[PDB]
Amino acid sequence: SGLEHCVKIIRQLECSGHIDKNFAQDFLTWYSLRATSQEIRVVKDFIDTFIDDPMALAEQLIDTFDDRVSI
């Protein structure tokens, strides 16, 4: 599922150190509970587009979603 895939990549980014623990946890909480269906589609598109570049993915996820994710 979309969530399983999202968790796998987010854990990878955290383990690689491209995102921190707090962002990883906030992001997954947000993605699974608060993200609209349209936002979920955007996350999936980001993940697909940046598949070859985890650092770029991380930076884009932070830039785009940090405000919505962190509270």
Numbering used by the authors: 620 to 690
Q: What did the authors write?
A:
The Arabidopsis VEL proteins are accessory proteins that interact with PRC2 to nucleate and propagate silencing at the FLOWERING LOCUS C (FLC) locus, enabling early flowering in spring. Here, we report that VEL proteins contain a domain related to an atypical four-helix bundle that engages in spontaneous concentration-dependent head-to-tail polymerization to assemble dynamic biomolecular condensates. The VEL domain adopts a compact globular fold, consisting of four α-helices in a quasi-antiparallel “up-down-up-down” configuration, each of which contributes to the hydrophobic core, as illustrated by VEL1VEL. Mutations blocking polymerization of this VEL domain prevent Polycomb silencing at FLC.
We conclude that the VEL head and tail surfaces are defined largely by three key residues, an isoleucine (VIN3I575 or VEL1I664) and two basic residues (VIN3R554,R556 or VEL1R643,K645), that engage in close hydrophobic or electrostatic interactions, respectively, with partner residues from the apposing complementary surface. The equivalent double mutation of VEL1VEL (RK>AD) also essentially blocks polymerization. Importantly, the RK>AD mutant never forms floaters nor fibers.
